[PDB]
Each structure stands twice: as C-alpha cells, then as structure tokens.
Coordinates of C-alpha atoms in Angstrom, one line a residue:
Chain M
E1 CA 8.7 2.6 73.2
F2 CA 7.0 4.9 70.6
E3 CA 8.0 2.9 67.6
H4 CA 4.9 0.9 68.7
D5 CA 2.7 4.0 68.8
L6 CA 3.9 4.8 65.3
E7 CA 2.9 1.2 64.3
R8 CA -0.7 1.7 65.3
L9 CA -1.0 4.9 63.3
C10 CA 0.1 3.3 60.1
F11 CA 0.7 -0.5 59.2
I12 CA 0.5 -3.2 56.6
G13 CA -2.9 -4.8 57.1
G14 CA -3.0 -7.3 54.2
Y15 CA -2.2 -8.0 50.6
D16 CA -5.5 -7.8 48.5
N17 CA -6.3 -10.2 45.6
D18 CA -3.3 -9.3 43.3
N19 CA -0.7 -9.9 46.0
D20 CA 0.2 -6.2 46.4
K21 CA 0.4 -4.4 49.7
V22 CA -2.6 -2.8 51.5
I23 CA -1.3 -0.2 53.9
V24 CA -3.7 1.2 56.6
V25 CA -3.4 4.6 58.3
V26 CA -5.7 5.4 61.3
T27 CA -5.8 9.2 61.4
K28 CA -7.4 9.5 64.8
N29 CA -4.2 7.9 66.2
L30 CA -2.2 11.1 65.5
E31 CA -3.1 12.0 69.2
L32 CA -0.7 9.5 70.8
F33 CA 2.2 11.7 69.7
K34 CA 1.0 14.6 71.7
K35 CA 2.6 13.0 74.8
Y36 CA 6.2 13.4 73.4
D37 CA 8.2 16.6 73.6
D38 CA 10.7 17.9 71.0
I39 CA 9.7 15.6 68.2
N40 CA 9.3 16.1 64.5
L41 CA 6.6 13.5 63.8
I42 CA 6.3 14.0 60.0
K43 CA 9.9 12.9 59.5
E44 CA 9.4 10.0 61.8
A45 CA 6.2 9.3 59.9
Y46 CA 7.8 9.7 56.5
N47 CA 10.8 7.4 57.2
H48 CA 8.4 4.8 58.6
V49 CA 6.2 4.6 55.5
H50 CA 9.5 4.4 53.6
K51 CA 10.2 1.3 55.7
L52 CA 6.7 -0.2 54.8
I53 CA 6.7 0.7 51.1
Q54 CA 10.0 0.4 49.1
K55 CA 10.3 1.8 45.7
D56 CA 8.8 -0.2 42.8
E57 CA 5.9 -1.6 45.0
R58 CA 2.4 -0.9 43.8
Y59 CA 0.1 -0.7 46.8
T60 CA -3.3 0.5 48.1
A61 CA -3.7 3.1 50.9
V62 CA -6.8 3.1 53.2
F63 CA -7.5 6.0 55.6
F64 CA -9.7 5.2 58.6
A65 CA -11.0 8.7 59.4
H66 CA -13.2 7.8 62.3
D67 CA -13.3 10.6 64.8
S68 CA -11.3 13.1 62.6
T69 CA -12.0 15.9 60.1
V70 CA -10.4 18.1 57.4
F71 CA -9.8 20.6 60.2
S72 CA -8.1 18.1 62.6
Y73 CA -6.4 14.7 62.0
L74 CA -7.6 13.8 58.6
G75 CA -6.5 17.2 57.3
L76 CA -2.9 16.7 58.3
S77 CA -2.6 13.0 57.3
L78 CA -3.8 13.9 53.8
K79 CA -1.7 17.0 53.6
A80 CA 1.3 14.8 54.7
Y81 CA 0.3 12.1 52.2
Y82 CA 0.4 14.9 49.6
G83 CA 3.9 16.0 50.5
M84 CA 5.4 12.5 49.8
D85 CA 7.8 11.8 47.0
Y86 CA 6.1 11.3 43.6
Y87 CA 6.8 7.6 43.4
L88 CA 4.4 7.0 46.3
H89 CA 1.6 8.8 44.3
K90 CA 2.6 7.0 41.1
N91 CA 2.6 3.6 42.7
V92 CA -0.8 3.6 44.4
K93 CA -3.7 1.6 42.9
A94 CA -6.2 3.6 45.0
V95 CA -6.7 5.7 48.1
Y96 CA -9.7 5.0 50.4
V97 CA -10.9 7.4 53.0
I98 CA -13.5 5.6 55.3
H99 CA -16.0 7.4 57.5
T100 CA -15.4 11.0 58.4
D101 CA -17.8 13.8 59.4
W102 CA -20.4 15.4 57.1
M103 CA -18.4 18.5 56.1
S104 CA -15.3 16.4 55.2
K105 CA -17.4 13.8 53.3
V106 CA -18.8 16.6 51.0
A107 CA -15.3 18.3 50.9
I108 CA -13.8 15.1 49.7
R109 CA -16.5 14.2 47.2
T110 CA -16.3 17.7 45.7
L111 CA -12.5 17.5 45.2
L112 CA -12.8 14.0 43.7
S113 CA -15.6 15.2 41.4
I114 CA -13.7 18.2 40.1
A115 CA -11.1 15.5 39.2
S116 CA -13.6 13.0 37.6
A117 CA -13.3 13.5 33.8
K118 CA -15.8 10.6 33.3
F119 CA -18.3 12.8 35.1
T120 CA -17.4 16.4 34.0
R121 CA -17.8 15.2 30.4
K122 CA -21.5 14.5 31.1
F123 CA -22.4 18.2 31.3
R124 CA -23.9 20.1 28.3
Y125 CA -24.4 23.9 28.5
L126 CA -27.5 25.1 26.7
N127 CA -28.7 28.7 26.2
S128 CA -32.5 28.3 26.8
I129 CA -35.3 25.8 27.4
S130 CA -35.8 25.7 23.6
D131 CA -32.4 24.1 22.9
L132 CA -33.2 21.3 25.5
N133 CA -36.1 20.0 23.3
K134 CA -33.5 18.2 21.1
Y135 CA -32.3 15.8 23.8
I136 CA -35.2 15.6 26.4
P137 CA -38.6 16.3 24.8
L138 CA -40.3 19.3 26.6
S139 CA -43.6 17.5 26.1
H140 CA -42.3 14.8 28.6
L141 CA -41.9 17.3 31.4
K142 CA -44.2 19.1 33.8
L143 CA -42.3 22.2 34.7
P144 CA -43.3 25.4 36.7
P145 CA -43.8 28.6 34.7
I146 CA -40.6 30.1 36.0
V147 CA -38.6 28.1 33.4
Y148 CA -40.7 29.8 30.6
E149 CA -40.2 33.6 30.6
Chain A
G1 CA -42.1 22.0 58.5
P2 CA -44.3 20.7 55.7
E3 CA -44.1 24.0 54.0
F4 CA -40.3 23.3 53.9
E5 CA -40.6 19.9 52.3
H6 CA -42.9 21.5 49.6
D7 CA -40.4 24.2 48.9
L8 CA -37.9 21.4 48.5
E9 CA -40.1 19.9 45.8
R10 CA -40.3 23.2 43.9
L11 CA -36.5 23.3 43.9
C12 CA -35.8 19.7 42.9
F13 CA -38.2 17.2 41.4
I14 CA -38.7 14.5 38.8
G15 CA -40.1 16.5 35.8
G16 CA -40.7 13.5 33.5
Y17 CA -39.0 10.4 31.9
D18 CA -36.9 9.9 28.7
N19 CA -37.2 7.0 26.2
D20 CA -35.7 4.0 27.9
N21 CA -38.0 5.3 30.7
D22 CA -35.6 6.8 33.3
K23 CA -36.1 9.8 35.6
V24 CA -35.4 13.3 34.4
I25 CA -35.0 15.2 37.7
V26 CA -34.8 19.0 37.2
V27 CA -33.6 21.7 39.6
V28 CA -35.3 25.1 39.0
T29 CA -32.3 26.8 40.6
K30 CA -33.8 30.2 41.1
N31 CA -36.3 28.7 43.7
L32 CA -33.5 28.7 46.4
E33 CA -34.8 32.1 47.4
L34 CA -37.8 30.3 49.0
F35 CA -35.5 29.3 51.8
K36 CA -34.3 32.8 52.7
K37 CA -37.5 33.0 54.8
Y38 CA -36.3 30.2 57.2
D39 CA -34.8 30.3 60.7
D40 CA -32.1 27.7 61.2
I41 CA -31.7 24.7 59.0
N42 CA -28.7 23.0 57.3
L43 CA -30.4 23.5 53.8
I44 CA -27.7 21.7 51.8
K45 CA -27.9 18.6 54.1
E46 CA -31.7 18.5 53.9
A47 CA -31.4 19.0 50.1
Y48 CA -29.0 16.1 49.8
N49 CA -31.5 14.0 51.8
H50 CA -34.3 15.0 49.3
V51 CA -32.3 13.9 46.2
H52 CA -31.4 10.6 47.9
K53 CA -35.1 9.7 48.0
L54 CA -35.8 11.1 44.5
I55 CA -33.1 8.7 43.0
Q56 CA -32.4 5.4 44.6
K57 CA -28.9 3.8 44.7
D58 CA -28.8 2.2 41.2
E59 CA -30.9 3.6 38.3
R60 CA -29.5 5.7 35.5
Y61 CA -31.1 9.1 35.3
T62 CA -30.9 12.6 33.7
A63 CA -30.5 15.9 35.5
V64 CA -31.2 19.4 34.1
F65 CA -30.6 22.8 35.8
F66 CA -32.6 25.8 34.7
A67 CA -31.2 29.3 35.3
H68 CA -31.8 31.7 32.4
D69 CA -31.5 35.3 33.7
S70 CA -28.2 36.4 35.2
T71 CA -29.1 38.5 38.4
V72 CA -26.8 37.9 41.5
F73 CA -26.1 35.4 40.7
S74 CA -28.5 32.9 39.0
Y75 CA -27.5 30.6 42.0
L76 CA -26.6 28.1 39.3
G77 CA -23.1 28.5 40.9
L78 CA -24.3 27.2 44.3
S79 CA -26.6 24.5 42.8
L80 CA -23.7 22.7 41.0
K81 CA -21.3 23.2 44.0
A82 CA -23.9 21.2 45.9
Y83 CA -24.3 18.7 43.1
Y84 CA -20.5 18.2 42.9
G85 CA -20.3 17.2 46.6
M86 CA -23.0 14.6 46.3
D87 CA -22.6 10.8 46.7
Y88 CA -20.5 9.0 44.1
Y89 CA -23.4 6.8 42.8
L90 CA -25.3 10.0 41.7
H91 CA -22.3 10.9 39.5
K92 CA -21.6 7.5 37.9
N93 CA -25.3 6.8 37.3
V94 CA -26.2 10.1 35.7
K95 CA -26.7 9.8 31.9
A96 CA -26.1 13.6 31.1
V97 CA -26.7 16.8 33.0
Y98 CA -28.0 19.9 31.2
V99 CA -27.5 23.5 32.3
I100 CA -29.6 26.3 30.8
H101 CA -27.8 29.6 31.5
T102 CA -26.1 31.3 28.4
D103 CA -23.4 33.0 30.6
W104 CA -22.1 29.6 31.7
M105 CA -18.5 30.1 30.6
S106 CA -17.9 32.7 33.3
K107 CA -19.2 30.3 35.9
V108 CA -17.5 27.1 34.9
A109 CA -14.2 28.6 33.7
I110 CA -12.9 28.2 37.3
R111 CA -14.1 24.6 37.6
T112 CA -12.7 23.7 34.1
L113 CA -9.3 24.9 35.3
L114 CA -9.4 23.1 38.7
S115 CA -10.2 20.0 36.7
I116 CA -7.3 20.6 34.4
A117 CA -4.9 20.9 37.4
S118 CA -6.5 18.0 39.3
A119 CA -3.5 15.8 39.9
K120 CA -3.4 12.2 38.6
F121 CA -2.8 11.1 42.2
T122 CA -6.1 12.5 43.4
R123 CA -8.2 10.6 40.7
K124 CA -7.3 7.4 42.5
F125 CA -9.2 8.3 45.7
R126 CA -12.7 7.1 46.7
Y127 CA -14.6 8.0 49.9
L128 CA -16.6 5.2 51.6
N129 CA -19.1 5.4 54.4
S130 CA -18.6 2.4 56.7
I131 CA -15.7 -0.1 56.5
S132 CA -18.0 -2.7 55.0
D133 CA -18.1 -0.6 51.8
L134 CA -14.4 -1.3 51.4
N135 CA -15.2 -4.9 50.7
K136 CA -15.7 -5.4 46.9
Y137 CA -12.7 -3.2 46.4
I138 CA -10.5 -5.2 48.8
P139 CA -11.8 -8.3 50.6
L140 CA -11.6 -7.6 54.3
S141 CA -10.7 -11.2 55.0
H142 CA -7.1 -10.4 53.9
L143 CA -6.7 -7.7 56.5
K144 CA -5.9 -7.1 60.1
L145 CA -8.1 -4.1 61.0
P146 CA -7.6 -1.7 64.0
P147 CA -9.9 -2.4 67.0
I148 CA -12.1 0.6 66.3
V149 CA -14.0 -0.9 63.4
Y150 CA -15.3 -3.4 66.1
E151 CA -17.3 -3.1 69.2
Chain T
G1 CA -26.1 54.2 37.1
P2 CA -25.1 56.5 40.0
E3 CA -27.4 54.3 42.1
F4 CA -25.2 51.4 41.1
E5 CA -22.0 53.1 42.1
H6 CA -23.6 53.8 45.5
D7 CA -24.6 50.2 46.1
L8 CA -21.0 49.4 45.3
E9 CA -19.8 51.6 48.2
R10 CA -22.4 50.1 50.5
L11 CA -21.1 46.6 49.7
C12 CA -17.3 47.3 49.9
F13 CA -15.8 50.5 51.4
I14 CA -12.9 51.7 53.4
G15 CA -13.8 51.2 57.0
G16 CA -11.0 52.9 59.0
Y17 CA -7.2 52.5 59.7
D18 CA -4.8 50.8 62.1
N19 CA -1.0 51.4 62.3
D20 CA 1.0 52.7 60.4
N21 CA -2.4 54.1 59.4
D22 CA -3.2 51.3 56.8
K23 CA -6.7 51.0 55.3
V24 CA -9.1 48.5 56.8
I25 CA -11.5 47.8 53.9
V26 CA -14.9 46.3 55.0
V27 CA -17.1 44.2 52.8
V28 CA -20.6 43.5 54.1
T29 CA -21.6 40.4 52.2
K30 CA -25.4 40.6 52.9
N31 CA -25.4 43.7 50.6
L32 CA -25.1 41.6 47.4
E33 CA -29.0 41.9 47.7
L34 CA -28.8 45.4 46.3
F35 CA -27.7 44.2 42.9
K36 CA -30.6 41.7 42.3
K37 CA -32.6 44.8 41.4
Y38 CA -30.4 45.4 38.3
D39 CA -30.5 44.2 34.7
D40 CA -27.4 43.6 32.5
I41 CA -24.0 44.4 34.1
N42 CA -21.1 42.0 35.0
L43 CA -21.3 42.6 38.8
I44 CA -18.1 40.7 39.4
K45 CA -16.0 42.9 37.0
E46 CA -17.5 46.0 38.4
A47 CA -16.6 45.0 42.0
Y48 CA -13.0 44.1 40.9
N49 CA -12.9 47.6 39.3
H50 CA -14.2 49.2 42.6
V51 CA -11.6 47.5 44.8
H52 CA -8.8 48.7 42.4
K53 CA -9.8 52.3 43.2
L54 CA -10.0 51.4 46.9
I55 CA -6.5 50.0 47.2
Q56 CA -3.5 51.1 45.1
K57 CA -0.7 48.7 44.1
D58 CA 2.0 48.4 46.7
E59 CA 0.1 49.5 50.0
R60 CA -0.7 47.1 52.9
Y61 CA -4.2 46.8 54.2
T62 CA -6.6 44.6 56.2
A63 CA -9.8 43.0 55.0
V64 CA -12.9 42.2 56.9
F65 CA -15.8 40.1 55.6
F66 CA -19.0 40.7 57.6
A67 CA -21.3 37.7 57.2
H68 CA -23.2 36.9 60.4
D69 CA -26.5 36.1 58.8
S70 CA -28.0 32.8 57.7
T71 CA -30.7 31.1 55.4
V72 CA -30.0 30.5 51.6
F73 CA -26.6 32.1 52.1
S74 CA -24.6 34.5 54.2
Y75 CA -23.1 35.8 50.8
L76 CA -19.7 34.9 52.3
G77 CA -18.8 32.1 49.9
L78 CA -19.7 34.2 46.9
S79 CA -17.7 37.1 48.0
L80 CA -14.7 35.0 49.2
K81 CA -14.8 33.2 45.8
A82 CA -14.7 36.7 44.2
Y83 CA -11.8 37.6 46.5
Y84 CA -9.7 34.6 45.4
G85 CA -9.6 35.7 41.7
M86 CA -8.3 39.1 42.4
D87 CA -4.8 40.4 41.2
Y88 CA -1.9 38.9 43.0
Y89 CA -0.8 42.1 44.6
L90 CA -4.0 42.2 46.6
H91 CA -3.2 38.9 48.2
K92 CA 0.6 39.6 48.8
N93 CA -0.2 42.9 50.5
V94 CA -3.2 42.0 52.7
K95 CA -2.1 41.9 56.4
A96 CA -5.0 39.8 57.7
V97 CA -8.5 38.7 56.5
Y98 CA -11.1 38.5 59.2
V99 CA -14.2 36.6 58.3
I100 CA -17.0 37.2 60.8
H101 CA -19.2 34.2 60.5
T102 CA -20.6 31.7 63.0
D103 CA -20.9 28.5 60.9
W104 CA -17.7 29.0 58.9
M105 CA -16.1 25.6 58.9
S106 CA -18.8 24.0 56.8
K107 CA -18.1 26.5 54.0
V108 CA -14.3 26.6 54.0
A109 CA -14.0 22.8 54.5
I110 CA -14.1 22.5 50.7
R111 CA -11.4 25.2 50.1
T112 CA -9.2 23.7 52.8
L113 CA -9.2 20.4 50.9
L114 CA -8.5 22.0 47.5
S115 CA -5.6 23.8 49.0
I116 CA -4.2 20.6 50.6
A117 CA -4.5 18.8 47.3
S118 CA -3.0 21.7 45.4
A119 CA 0.2 20.5 43.7
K120 CA 3.7 22.0 44.3
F121 CA 3.7 22.4 40.5
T122 CA 0.7 24.7 40.6
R123 CA 2.4 26.7 43.3
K124 CA 5.2 27.5 40.8
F125 CA 2.8 29.4 38.5
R126 CA 2.1 33.2 38.2
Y127 CA -0.1 35.1 35.8
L128 CA 1.2 38.3 34.3
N129 CA -1.1 40.8 32.5
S130 CA 1.3 42.1 29.9
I131 CA 4.6 40.8 28.4
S132 CA 6.1 43.9 30.0
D133 CA 5.4 42.7 33.5
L134 CA 7.6 39.6 32.8
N135 CA 10.7 41.8 32.9
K136 CA 10.7 41.8 36.7
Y137 CA 11.4 38.1 36.8
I138 CA 13.2 37.2 33.6
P139 CA 15.0 40.0 31.7
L140 CA 13.5 40.3 28.2
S141 CA 16.8 41.4 26.5
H142 CA 17.9 37.7 27.0
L143 CA 15.2 36.4 24.8
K144 CA 13.9 35.9 21.2
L145 CA 10.2 36.8 21.4
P146 CA 7.7 35.6 18.9
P147 CA 6.4 38.4 16.6
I148 CA 3.0 38.2 18.3
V149 CA 4.1 40.2 21.4
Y150 CA 4.9 43.0 18.9
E151 CA 3.0 45.4 16.7
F152 CA 5.3 46.1 13.7
Chain U
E1 CA 7.4 20.5 6.9
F2 CA 5.1 19.8 9.9
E3 CA 8.1 19.4 12.2
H4 CA 8.4 22.9 10.8
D5 CA 5.2 23.9 12.6
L6 CA 6.3 23.3 16.2
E7 CA 9.3 25.5 16.8
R8 CA 6.8 28.3 16.1
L9 CA 4.6 27.0 19.1
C10 CA 7.5 26.0 21.5
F11 CA 11.1 27.2 21.5
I12 CA 14.0 27.8 23.8
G13 CA 13.6 31.6 23.8
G14 CA 16.7 32.2 25.9
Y15 CA 18.4 31.9 29.3
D16 CA 17.9 33.6 32.7
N17 CA 20.7 35.2 34.8
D18 CA 21.2 31.8 36.6
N19 CA 22.1 30.2 33.2
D20 CA 19.0 27.9 32.8
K21 CA 16.7 27.6 29.8
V22 CA 13.4 29.4 29.4
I23 CA 10.8 27.7 27.1
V24 CA 8.3 29.8 25.3
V25 CA 4.9 28.4 24.4
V26 CA 2.6 30.5 22.2
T27 CA -0.8 28.8 22.7
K28 CA -2.4 30.6 19.9
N29 CA -0.1 29.0 17.3
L30 CA -2.0 25.6 17.6
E31 CA -4.4 25.7 14.5
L32 CA -1.4 25.2 12.2
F33 CA -2.5 21.6 12.7
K34 CA -6.2 21.6 11.7
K35 CA -4.7 21.3 8.2
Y36 CA -2.9 18.0 8.6
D37 CA -5.2 15.0 9.4
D38 CA -3.8 11.7 10.8
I39 CA -1.3 13.7 12.9
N40 CA -1.8 13.0 16.6
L41 CA -0.3 16.4 17.7
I42 CA -0.2 15.7 21.5
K43 CA 2.5 13.0 21.2
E44 CA 4.5 14.9 18.6
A45 CA 4.4 17.8 21.0
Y46 CA 5.6 15.8 24.0
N47 CA 8.4 14.4 21.8
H48 CA 9.4 17.9 20.6
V49 CA 9.5 19.4 24.2
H50 CA 11.5 16.3 25.4
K51 CA 14.1 17.4 22.8
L52 CA 14.4 20.9 24.4
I53 CA 14.6 19.9 28.2
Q54 CA 17.0 17.2 29.2
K55 CA 15.9 15.0 32.2
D56 CA 18.2 16.7 34.8
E57 CA 17.7 20.3 33.8
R58 CA 16.0 23.3 35.6
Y59 CA 14.1 25.6 33.4
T60 CA 11.4 28.3 33.2
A61 CA 8.2 28.1 31.1
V62 CA 6.2 31.1 29.8
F63 CA 2.9 30.7 28.1
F64 CA 2.0 33.5 25.7
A65 CA -1.8 33.1 26.0
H66 CA -2.7 35.9 23.6
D67 CA -5.9 34.8 21.7
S68 CA -6.8 31.8 23.9
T69 CA -9.1 31.0 26.8
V70 CA -9.4 28.0 29.2
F71 CA -11.9 26.6 26.6
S72 CA -9.4 26.6 23.7
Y73 CA -5.7 26.6 23.0
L74 CA -4.6 27.7 26.5
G75 CA -6.8 25.1 28.2
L76 CA -5.3 22.3 26.0
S77 CA -1.7 23.7 26.4
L78 CA -2.2 23.5 30.2
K79 CA -4.0 20.2 30.2
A80 CA -1.1 19.0 28.1
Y81 CA 1.5 20.6 30.4
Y82 CA -0.2 18.8 33.3
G83 CA 0.0 15.5 31.5
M84 CA 3.8 15.5 31.4
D85 CA 6.2 13.3 33.3
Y86 CA 6.9 14.4 36.8
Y87 CA 10.4 15.7 36.2
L88 CA 9.2 18.5 34.1
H89 CA 7.1 19.7 37.1
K90 CA 9.9 19.1 39.6
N91 CA 12.4 21.0 37.4
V92 CA 10.6 24.2 36.4
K93 CA 11.5 27.2 38.5
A94 CA 8.3 29.0 37.4
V95 CA 5.5 29.0 34.9
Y96 CA 4.3 32.4 33.6
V97 CA 1.0 32.8 31.8
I98 CA 0.9 36.1 29.9
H99 CA -2.1 38.0 28.8
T100 CA -5.3 35.9 28.4
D101 CA -9.0 37.0 28.5
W102 CA -10.8 38.2 31.6
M103 CA -12.5 34.9 32.4
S104 CA -9.3 32.9 32.2
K105 CA -7.3 35.5 34.1
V106 CA -9.8 35.1 36.9
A107 CA -9.8 31.3 36.6
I108 CA -6.0 31.3 36.8
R109 CA -5.8 33.7 39.7
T110 CA -8.4 31.6 41.6
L111 CA -6.5 28.3 41.2
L112 CA -3.2 30.0 42.2
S113 CA -4.8 31.5 45.3
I114 CA -6.2 28.3 46.5
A115 CA -2.6 26.9 46.0
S116 CA -0.9 29.9 47.8
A117 CA -0.3 28.8 51.4
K118 CA 1.1 32.2 52.3
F119 CA -2.3 33.7 51.3
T120 CA -4.7 31.3 53.0
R121 CA -2.6 31.5 56.2
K122 CA -3.9 35.1 56.6
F123 CA -7.6 34.3 57.2
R124 CA -8.9 34.4 60.8
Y125 CA -12.5 33.2 61.2
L126 CA -14.1 35.1 64.1
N127 CA -17.6 34.1 65.3
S128 CA -19.1 37.6 65.6
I129 CA -18.2 41.3 65.3
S130 CA -17.3 41.4 69.0
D131 CA -14.2 39.2 68.5
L132 CA -13.0 41.6 65.8
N133 CA -12.3 44.1 68.6
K134 CA -9.1 42.5 69.8
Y135 CA -7.5 42.7 66.3
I136 CA -9.0 45.8 64.6
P137 CA -10.5 48.2 67.2
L138 CA -14.2 49.1 66.5
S139 CA -13.4 52.7 67.6
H140 CA -11.8 52.9 64.2
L141 CA -14.6 51.8 61.9
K142 CA -17.6 53.4 60.2
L143 CA -20.0 50.6 59.8
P144 CA -23.6 50.2 58.6
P145 CA -26.1 49.2 61.3
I146 CA -26.6 45.8 59.6
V147 CA -23.3 44.5 61.0
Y148 CA -24.6 45.0 64.5
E149 CA -28.1 43.3 64.5

C-alpha cells in the first residue's frame, strides 16, 4: 500500500502551543514514489494535504530538507507548495525549512531577505563618504585610503 | 593562505564604534579584485565565515559599504547579493546599513521591485539549521518527528 | 570611442549559424574586463543597444555564454542578470541558451528559487514601451484614454 | 470633491473583445493628494477600485506609468496592487505597464523574466566548451582563443 508511503512524506506531527495543527513534510521521501509506474504524484500529494488541512484551519508547515536541495527534492516540494490554492498560503502561521545544503541555504535566505521589509528599510543610500559623517562620525573609523579619492 | 585571510580583512573589517559602543563593520567593496589572483576557493563561503567571527550571534551593529566610482561594476552589486543571503541574525541585529555609491538607483531598482512583488506567503518562511533550532518557535515535545532527526 | 565599440564586439558578437541558418550570438563574459579601463558611460545601456543591432525583432537565434573561468567572478552572473532585463522579444525568440560554466549550480540556485516563488499574478504582467504597442492585445478604439497619452 | 480626484487616477476605460472590463491606472495622477491632509489615500483607493471590479469578474489592468519610476508613483501603485485581496489577482487576465523610465523598464523586465517559466526552460548548463559541440557545432563558430584555454 502506497497510501502509507504518502503518509511518511507528509503528516500531522503535533499541535503547537495555540492548539493549531503542525504539518510536517519530509522532502527526501519524494524518492519512494519512483517505484510506481503511471502515477501523477502531485495530484495524489495535493488531495492528501487537503485531507490533512481543511479550509478555515490555521496551521504551521515544517520542511525537513535533509538530503535534498533546490535542484532536487526541496525544489519540487516548495514549487508544489507554491502551486496550492491561496487559502493554504493565507492560513499558515509560518513555514520552516530545516537543514539543506549550502547553496540552498543561501538561496532561501536571499529570497526571504528580499521579502523582509523590516530589513530593507534599514538601508540608506549616500553619495560620498562626506554624507556619512552625519550618522557615523568619520573620526571614529580607521579606513584605508581607497575610501578617500 | 595567510595572505588570503589578510585580503579578507582589507575587504571586511570593524572600522570603529558608534555611541552606545557597537561595532561599525565596513566593507570596502572594490577590494574584491584582490581575490582574482587566487586558484580555487569558494570565496563567498569563506567571506561568510569571516563575517561570522567579526560579529557574534547577538550584538546590534552597523554596516557600511563603500563604492564611489562606477567602473564595471563597482562590485557593490555582488557585495549586497552576498549580504542578502547571510544568516538571519545578521539582518535582525543590524541597526542600519549605509551604501556610498551615487548611482545606487540603477543597482537597487531591480531589488526594490522584487521586494514589492514578494508575496505575503513568502514572508512567513524561516530557514533553520538543525531541528533543535525549531524549538522556541514550536516545542518539539508536541511532535512526532521522522526517524531521520535521530541516530 | 571607436575603441569602445570594438570592445563591445569582443564581448558580444555573432558567432555563426545553425539551421535554418539562424544566428548563434556568443557572449564571452570574461571580456567585461575591457570596460574597467573606461570613465563615464552606462555600460549596461550600451550593451543593450549593441544586442539590438545584432538581433532584429522577429528572428530566432541561439545564445551562448562562455564563462569557464574562476576567482572573483566568471562574469556569468553579471551578464545573465543583464540578459534577464532585455526586451521580451529577445526571450520569446531565443531557441536555447547554453551557459558554459563548471560551477554553475551555486550561482543559479538563487534564481531557481526566485522563479519557484514567482507568483502566478506576476506571470500575468507584460511591459509595453508605447501606448501604441498595447493595440496588439486590447484594441484601443474600445477605450477612453486619459489626455496624457496624447499631445493636443 | 476628493472623490472627484480618483476617477482621474483609475477608471473603467472600456471593454475587450471578450466583453470584460479593462481598468486604467495613471500612476502619475497621484500628487492630487499632497494637498489634502488627514486623507489616508491607500484605503480610499482600495474602496474606489472595489466599486469598479465585482468579486466574480475577469478584467484587464493597464498602468500608464508615464512620469513615474519604481521609486515613486509607479512603485506605490504596484506595491498597492500587490496588497489587494487575492481575487483581484486571480481574476485579471493581464497587467500592462506602459512607458516608464529606463531603470524601471529594466527592473520590470527582469522580474517578469524570472517569472517566465517558458524562458528559464531554455537554459542548458554545459560544463565546458566541448559539450557545446553536440548542440551547436564548433565548425560553425568564430571564437576568440580565450574560450579554449
């Protein structure tokens, strides 16, 4: 029975401290489904998550990305998570990706950081060293001569 | 070898401290050309490692990027791409970051738009290194976890 | 001046043809070095101008990015970024885009994620240069247009 | 009055051949509000547009971006368009942005080209020049000697 394989790829692991669902997906386990022939997978996957999250439920998603990357399993899991109906995106408290390779780590942090308004507000674009003196005193910094020419 | 770690310090270093006495780490972008002379090294990985020891896991700090003349490019482009894929704590804990470029608008017009179009969905995500880091956000006692987070 | 136009052709040129005799336009990325010598200029706008003369509107072609080098940069990210902000017809009409680089994944890992997370809404957009170009898609006779698209 | 300064920024300019609305936004016309004070502008705007597109209704949207960049007017009109309830994004058939400055044109084309799956499908990452031979024959190419060291 493959409905069991499909239950070790994605399952309800717990219920956090607010009593809302915490659904786990273990991306590396997308390899069990290679053994089947003439399957869809993403429709099987989509109707299964629909069985684990009904409409109106606020939940948390957690992706265990051990032994997968943006170019293999974690790529498709996340692409597939993005293709979900909007209510799944509206109703998540947070998505967690845990432990992937170095590439994908810095791929993810870049995407998240482009999206972090809290952070992109912190930038301040000045035209020369002179205009910095107002915020950080130039008498407080040892700098090479390159920054002065 | 050691010449490499010294070129790292000419690229990124603590220049001084502000009032409230916190680090002001500068990156003299330009100085990335010092690395063109090298054989095989993942520069960006070694550079992330250097910053990680310049600023420890909780201390508010300031960052400033110098890149005055245009050229091809000022490599300011690549320095902020690197800074954007850095650890999360380095973004939450930074007080302000100053770029000195003049022609900045042409650079960061693309990144301003990608930020505009960033979905509301993708602002919910957070990357974590080990599964222990997921505690504090969700207590792992509430959870059955797959056998791979165990030996 | 003329030296600048020559460094442009050393960077991006027509390389050859395939079948039915469609241009293969090579860009050797390591050749962005030639422009560090210069002062002033918007290199990115000059290169966009140069490609426009190398490939006319509706005409299929193949692109090849040569970046086998290493150190600070292969120049492949900077010239792929430049390629992504080119007019839509250059992307519709390219047959294939061969990027010759060893360590390529570590660069395009970031763009693969941004494409994954790109919304379906964003995919509905299109930039047009002039109000005239909109006629193709929605007929302008059907519409009241604000006086601003006019010059009474 | 002020409700009389919105129809000049957003109107149902007409209908396409398939008999669905087309909504014009003229991003420039957005300083007719610096003269008001108190006015929140963003919520009045959302209310106005909600009165031109009914919930179940497919439409087009065109942005006349004459005299605006990603750093003014056009940037806020798009940040605002992105802030809208999901049905406005599900329901558009297309979004046209017309005639902005060179920066923004390049910024817009870049975002769309990351989005465009048909485009990014066309890349093939070969490891060295030798592998290019199976696709484009090197008999056919004038190349500098650099591509061969």
